[PDB]
Amino acid sequence: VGRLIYTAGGYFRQSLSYLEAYNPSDGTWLRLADLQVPRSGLAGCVVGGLLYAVGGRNNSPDGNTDSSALDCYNPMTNQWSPCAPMSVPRNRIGVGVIDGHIYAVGGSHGCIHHNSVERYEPERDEWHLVAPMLTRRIGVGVAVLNRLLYAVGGFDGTNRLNSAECYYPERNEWRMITAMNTIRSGAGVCVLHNCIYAAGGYDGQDQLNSVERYDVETETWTFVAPMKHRRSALGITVHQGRIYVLGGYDGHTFLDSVECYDPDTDTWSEVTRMTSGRSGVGVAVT
Amino acid sequence: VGRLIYTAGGYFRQSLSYLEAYNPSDGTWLRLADLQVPRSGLAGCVVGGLLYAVGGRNNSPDGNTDSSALDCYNPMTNQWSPCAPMSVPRNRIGVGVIDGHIYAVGGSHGCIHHNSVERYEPERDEWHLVAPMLTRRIGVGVAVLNRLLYAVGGFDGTNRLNSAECYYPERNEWRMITAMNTIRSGAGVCVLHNCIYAAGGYDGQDQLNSVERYDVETETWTFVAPMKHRRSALGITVHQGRIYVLGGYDGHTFLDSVECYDPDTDTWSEVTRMTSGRSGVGVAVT
């Protein structure tokens, strides 16, 4: 099939411009075209074979600037192009795709913590607001399952969250679901074999190595095997029925480690290293 | 004989836990007990031979937590002990001492820019609200002169300030005084030979190297010699009739520079370097 894991931006001493692609078949890395503006705390997603980099910020020694930007990478041309910006900047954003539309969830603009949600239509190059979440969430994770969107954990401006809620696109409304076992902001959230996984993050004291998964029909969260390395602000994605987690912060180091979860054996292994340690990347597969 | 300049906390990529002491006699630095929790934008002060660290925040890769904390350092035991916390968190706070009581002035909690002021009594370990300032002020400097407390400059949420106001403890009220020549948030404010000095800061465009002083009887601000290096969020104190400024930010670099003002000759000289560059430290002498 020949699909790659793309990692965009990140943070080490400042926000970064890197776009690199890992091939899990032959263990190779490509160095592709730099972002036009450095970005960390962003999200990656794919629609119709194009890579999108959504929100984040530029934390340099010269200043802090939260991003409302949407930028589109075409793997055929190795070129980044600007798209219409979001209504508001969103640092530590969550994103999901339903039916070829991009949903931008939560995030921060300076001291402001958003509950607002907006939807991008690629064919019209336009954003529109939809119903807001029940809870303000920054450092939030997002998963799409059965044409519904789930927002998991984060920070509401006062409290770090174990809570999660579910968006119904046809009805345009949110409902709270069963809360996680562990409080998590800056966790990796994805979907594997009809379950929502939450890996790592920060519980208010420590960076986590624990991993839990939500079965939509049993309505219960269950612990699986933990990761080797504790990490917050990790990238996460799924390639060929396996979870890959990229980089993050362990409370001392910005990690170059990539771990892989095999659901059949319930084991994690270290598969490769990024070319340099970083946190707050956006990641997607195409 | 044998008073040291203590520097506590600060920021370089993340909030710091350092306590270090400079001896201007022999040019030595001591490395003392780390703060229990990292802090930047705090203020330092001394009562009865004890050093106090008041307010600030912990800007780490996992979050931004404004601090209401008051912590006491005993140089005889090299130990930090927790004291009663303030009514509210105060980042980029101002602090002054009158009659063995600590005054906490202004600062921020998230989006909120405080005009409130509270007073700590060490003999009872309690805080109480006193009259609020006429102006909301974060990045404010404080000076005590003739048993009155002066609040100088800062940022009110919208505008940076050249305004200054005077607190009367017996009457429990504030009055505006003559405004500075220059707009300054994050200046160093101290008292030397019966005048209030404001050194450096930020005017909304540039970090400043200018220095002006207020004479309470002429009701006039006058420029003196400028520092060698422009800086905001600097530490400031007085030792043996001279002003010491420690570190800060120049719009690109976090400074390790310590400069010294001789008022007899109206000249600044570089006397030493901190072990590492940092801004937003708390400083006091004992």
Ligand code: NA
């Ligand atoms: Na920055």
Ligand code: NA
């Ligand atoms: Na996800």
Ligand code: NA
């Ligand atoms: Na932070």
Ligand code: NA
């Ligand atoms: Na002062």
